[PDB]
Amino acid sequence: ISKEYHIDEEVGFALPNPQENLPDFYNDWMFIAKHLPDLIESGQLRERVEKLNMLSIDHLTDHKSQRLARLVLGCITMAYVWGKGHGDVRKVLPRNIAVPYCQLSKKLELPPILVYADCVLANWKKKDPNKPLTYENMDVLFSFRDGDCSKGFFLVSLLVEIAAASAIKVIPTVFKAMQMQERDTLLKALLEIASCLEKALQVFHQIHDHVNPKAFFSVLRIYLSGWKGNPQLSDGLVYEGFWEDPKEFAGGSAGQSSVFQCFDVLLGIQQTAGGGHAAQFLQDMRRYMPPAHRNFLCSLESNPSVREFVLSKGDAGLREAYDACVKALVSLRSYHLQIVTKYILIPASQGTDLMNFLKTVRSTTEKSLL
């Protein structure tokens, strides 16, 4: 059983039952975010961000409240800087909203920009508290524009994180099986992690039914892009009243998903080795995860290597069970690679930086087989 890594045995890395409402003191922030599709189109979003007061973060006591306040402020920032999403970029964030978002981001050890942990892990709720977690029974908390498939893009992303929750709980079982030298306990525990990663691929299939190719490329992808190496903000975003210099921060990508790196590290796949772009990007995106997940990924690399344990015993039965988890990963990297073609490459032709990246993390996964 995992410790104070804020990993839930039911939903995994996602926030378990996230809050929907801040205290009534923060009605100004909750109002702008809950009506984002209308204020962006009406042109008064950026006005209502300017006619704001500099509120205090101190009223955010419990954990679930600060995450939402990062979630509400993260969406406003992406909506403010990008506007309707056609070129009118605001290279300055106003102080009455820049310094409260930077205070809370420094609080949660997160960057002051919308990340995967905000719009996926803490951005959901159950329609019926008695009916189980499925797409038809769950809904998002915030969106960008009308018909952007942000419900489908985020809930399907979240749905696969819940399938991995049934595999992360097996990690302590594997690590103590190696310590106690119990082979059968390790063989089944490896088979179980593989099997849950097999079920997680079927959850990935749902993305076609709830997300549209060009509705994602044109509407949602524009607001999720950040300002690190982005040409529209050559130096980044100035946080007025917090940093005198413009600060470069990466946007949101699947690399910030903790299950992305969770099993690469466990199975001994040195995805962060070498000076490659994928190995550097996977290490840089750890700073964009919650602090509890930064240390959980850290604790796995500290624990003994599971790969060398199987490669040493000369046990073909263990070699086949371990190879099943690697094959389950390749099946996901090969499906994730397919989704990017239908959703980025072909829309972009009426783009390839994510393509060349995701081919390398899969290529490394195939080279791990025995």
Q: Residue 224, interface with ligand YRP (CB under 6 A)? A: yes
| Tokens standing for residue 349 | 């032709």
Amino acid at 155: L
Comparison of 174 and 325: residue with beta carbon closer to ligand YRP: 325
Q: Residue 162, interface with ligand YRP (CB under 6 A)? A: no
Neighbouring C-alpha atoms within 13 Å toward the C-beta of 79: 30
Q: Compute the distance between CA of residue 264 and CA of residue 226 in angstroms, rounded to an integer.
A: 26
Confirm or deny that 63 is annotated as ligand binding.
no
What is the chain's length? 370
Cα separation values, 329 from 170, 198, 199, 222, Å: 16, 9, 12, 29
CB 265 within 8 A of CB 271: yes
Q: Compute the distance between CA of residue 343 and CA of residue 355 in angstroms, rounded to an integer.
A: 11
Q: Residue 223, interface with ligand YRP (CB under 6 A)? A: no
Binding segment (CB under 6 A) for ligand YRP, from list 39-47, 62-70, 301-309, 325-333: 325-333
Q: Residue 254, interface with ligand YRP (CB under 6 A)? A: yes
Q: Residue 117, interface with ligand YRP (CB under 6 A)? A: no
Sole binder of ligand YRP in the list 30, 45, 259, 289 (CB under 6 A): 259
Q: Residue 329, interface with ligand YRP (CB under 6 A)? A: yes
- In whole angstroms, the minimum distance from the beta carbon of 84 to ligand YRP comes to 20
Sole binder of ligand YRP in the list 85, 152, 226, 252 (CB under 6 A): 252
| Tokens standing for residue 227 | 């300002």
Q: Count residues contacting ligand YRP (CB under 6 A)? A: 18
Q: Residue 364, interface with ligand YRP (CB under 6 A)? A: no
Contacts 24+ apart (CB under 8 A), 225-234: 225/82, 225/251, 226/113, 226/250, 226/251, 226/252, 227/81, 227/113, 227/251, 232/87, 232/89, 233/81, 233/89, 233/91
CB 303 within 8 A of CB 241: no
Q: Compute the distance between CA of residue 162 and CA of residue 133 in angstroms, rounded to an integer.
A: 9
Q: Compute the distance between CA of residue 14 and CA of residue 164 in angstroms, rounded to an integer.
A: 11
Comparison of 46 and 161: residue with beta carbon closer to ligand YRP: 161
Comparison of 51 and 205: residue with beta carbon closer to ligand YRP: 205
Amino acid at 77: T
Q: Residue 257, interface with ligand YRP (CB under 6 A)? A: yes
Q: Residue 237, interface with ligand YRP (CB under 6 A)? A: no
Q: Residue 212, interface with ligand YRP (CB under 6 A)? A: no
Q: Residue 272, interface with ligand YRP (CB under 6 A)? A: no
Comparison of 26 and 322: residue with beta carbon closer to ligand YRP: 322
Q: Residue 157, interface with ligand YRP (CB under 6 A)? A: yes
Comparison of 26 and 153: residue with beta carbon closer to ligand YRP: 153
Sole binder of ligand YRP in the list 167, 168, 207, 321 (CB under 6 A): 207
- In whole angstroms, the minimum distance from the beta carbon of 278 to ligand YRP comes to 12
By DSSP bridging, strand 92-93 and strand 125-126 are: unpaired
Q: Residue 30, interface with ligand YRP (CB under 6 A)? A: no
CB 64 within 8 A of CB 109: no
Comparison of 212 and 253: residue with beta carbon closer to ligand YRP: 253
Would you tell me which residues interact with ligand YRP (CB under 6 A)?
116, 119-120, 156-157, 160, 207, 224, 252-254, 257, 259-260, 329, 332-333, 336
